[PDB]
Design a protein around this nucleic acid. Structure first.
Ligand SMILES: [Zn+2]
Length: 254
DNA sequence: TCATCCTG
DNA sequence: CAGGAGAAGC
């Protein structure tokens, strides 16, 4: 689950319990149990996301950090309900009518306000592709900056220090949209291609966020190996790139 | 390499 | 039941 999916999840967590006094709080991890009594009667003020990091802010200035990696998932349930699952429960935040449940995630910690800027991941991450104040012009600047202009896209588009929220499907989908393979660097692009890439880096994640949970977002090459490309008809290929699966079209990506 | 889930 | 599906340690 990439930036769009984690922001959809966060939106659902807010709808369920933002502003509501907590009637129960539970953590699986022994080192977090101390916060359970502390948070009962407090409430979630907002659920912030920075890329794939989810920040559950409470009314006493603590913030729960959670990161799902490849396997964590939140569920919203009615209070007291708990559908059968073999996943391991790691967090419960319960209110009078709704409860949110975090399953399977292993990266979970409680932050004091100072840690919102010093935590090792939070300190490293770049601008978020879903932040509406982030513009294609600033992304263009970032691509051309000395720090990133010599980075191959294969790895750059997975690096959260560049843009927060991109993961492997968005890497695949963005590169296909602008006709590029992973072996390029921003310094070698012409102005038209740079502009198209800067726009796609924001527009495809934003489109996924807006409509995957529903013109609607669809994959053009991710998991479509062996199918004809919708643009040129070539058979989409699956290989590995940066130690991750990679999907692309040999007829229209160069 | 870690970490959890699901698959082939 | 190994081998595949976000990030950091080196
Ligand atoms: Zn094609």
């Amino acid at each position: 689950p990439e930036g769009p999916e984690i922001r959809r999840a966060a939106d659902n967590l807010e709808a369920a319990i933002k502003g509501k006094p907590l009637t129960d709080v539970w953590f699986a991890f022994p080192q977090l149990k101390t916060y359970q009594s502390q948070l009962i009667g407090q409430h979630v003020t907002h659920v912030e996301t920075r890329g794939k990091a989810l920040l559950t802010h409470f009314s006493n200035d603590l913030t729960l950090y959670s990161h799902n990696q490849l396997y964590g998932v939140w569920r919203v349930v009615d209070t007291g309900e708990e559908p059968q699952t073999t996943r391991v429960l790691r967090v419960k935040l319960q209110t009078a009518d709704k409860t949110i449940l975090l399953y399977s995630a292993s990266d979970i910690e409680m932050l004091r306000p100072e840690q919102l800027t010093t935590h090792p991941f939070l300190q490293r991450v770049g601008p978020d592709v879903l932040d509406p104040n982030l513009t294609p012009e600033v992304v263009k600047e970032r691509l051309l900056s000395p720090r990133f202009r010599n980075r191959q896209f294969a790895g750059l588009l997975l690096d959260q220090a560049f843009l927060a929220g991109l993961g492997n499907y968005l890497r695949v989908e963005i590169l296909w949209q602008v006709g590029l393979t992973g072996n390029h660097k921003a310094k070698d692009l012409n102005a038209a291609q740079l502009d198209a890439l800067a726009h796609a880096l924001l527009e495809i994640p934003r489109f996924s966020y807006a409509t995957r949970g529903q013109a609607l977002f669809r994959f053009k090459v991710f998991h479509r190996d062996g199918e004809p490309c919708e643009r040129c008809g070539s058979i989409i290929e699956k290989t590995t790139l940066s130690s991750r699966p990679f999907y692309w079209c040999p007829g229209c990506q160069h």
